[PDB]
Amino acid sequence: PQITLWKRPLVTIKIGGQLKEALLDTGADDTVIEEMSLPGRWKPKMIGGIGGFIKVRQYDQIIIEIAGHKAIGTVLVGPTPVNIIGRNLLTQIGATLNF
Amino acid sequence: PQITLWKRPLVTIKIGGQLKEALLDTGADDTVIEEMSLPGRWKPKMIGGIGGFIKVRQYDQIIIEIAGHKAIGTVLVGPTPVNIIGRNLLTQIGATLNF
Numbered sequence: 001p002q003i004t005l006w007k008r009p010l011v012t013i014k015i016g017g018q019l020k021e022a023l024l025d026t027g028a029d030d031t032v033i034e035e036m037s038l039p040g041r042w043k044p045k046m047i048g049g050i051g052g053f054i055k056v057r058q059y060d061q062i063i064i065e066i067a068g069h070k071a072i073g074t075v076l077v078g079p080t081p082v083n084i085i086g087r088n089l090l091t092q093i094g095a096t097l098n099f
Numbered sequence: 100p101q102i103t104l105w106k107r108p109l110v111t112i113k114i115g116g117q118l119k120e121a122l123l124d125t126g127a128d129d130t131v132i133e134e135m136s137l138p139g140r141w142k143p144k145m146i147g148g149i150g151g152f153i154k155v156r157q158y159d160q161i162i163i164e165i166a167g168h169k170a171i172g173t174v175l176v177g178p179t180p181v182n183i184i185g186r187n188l189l190t191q192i193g194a195t196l197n198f
């Protein structure tokens with residue numbers, strides 16, 4: 001499937017058995033999900049962009065579904081303004097930016 | 100042109116007659132460029148990112164070139180750590196997401 005960028009590129013994802021929405025973000029190195037109860041081992045990390053950095057929980061080898069596609073990798077959990085699917089997982093589902 | 104996402108999707112832009120690198124950023128509504136002198140009228144604006152808000156100068160109807168494509172539209176100038184090309188201009192260059 002293919003998406004223009006006339007609207008925010010929101011897709012449904014499944015994480016820890018819960019449905020959420022998230023932005024497919026080519027500008028994001030990493031994947032950042034709002035605070036939630038997520039089983040798994042984690043370690044503290046900072047992640048940043050415009051406006052500075054926030055402290056997040058770094059979970060490795062998390063199974064997540066992104067628009068129907070299964071991916072497994074690192075997910076950062078923290079006080080992000082919006083759920084973000086970054087390049088670490090977009091690459092695993094074979095997403096590309098075309099023009 | 101099909102950009103895989105193993106590395107940050109950086110391209111060359113031309114703005115105010117100067118070449119710069121910039122990131123193609125499907126998660127950004129707007130296009131934000133680091134501090135530079137640009138001639139003409141602007142208005143003040145605040146935009147938000149992962150770490151909070153920054154103040155920017157909002158310039159409308161700027162002529163810009165992005166990876167060889169012409170565009171004309173709104174450019175925000177302020178203390179972003181990375182020059183970003185948001186959806187307002189990505190739609191002009193015809194960028195789409197594919198997976």
Ligand SMILES: CC(C)[C@H](NC(=O)COc1ccccc1)C(=O)N[C@@H](Cc1ccccc1)[C@@H](O)[C@H](N)[C@H](O)Cc1ccccc1
Nearest residue numbers: 027028029030048049050081082124126127148149180181
């Ligand atoms: C998510 C982050 C892991 C990501 N940052 C990065 O991927 C790398 O961040 C840095 C920070 C400093 C220096 C060098 C690199 C990011 O901010 N990505 C942003 C672009 C960017 C900003 C600053 C530096 C590098 C990229 C955008 O893609 C951003 N995710 C969107 O605006 C999404 C969004 C929409 C609405 C509200 C809040 C967030």
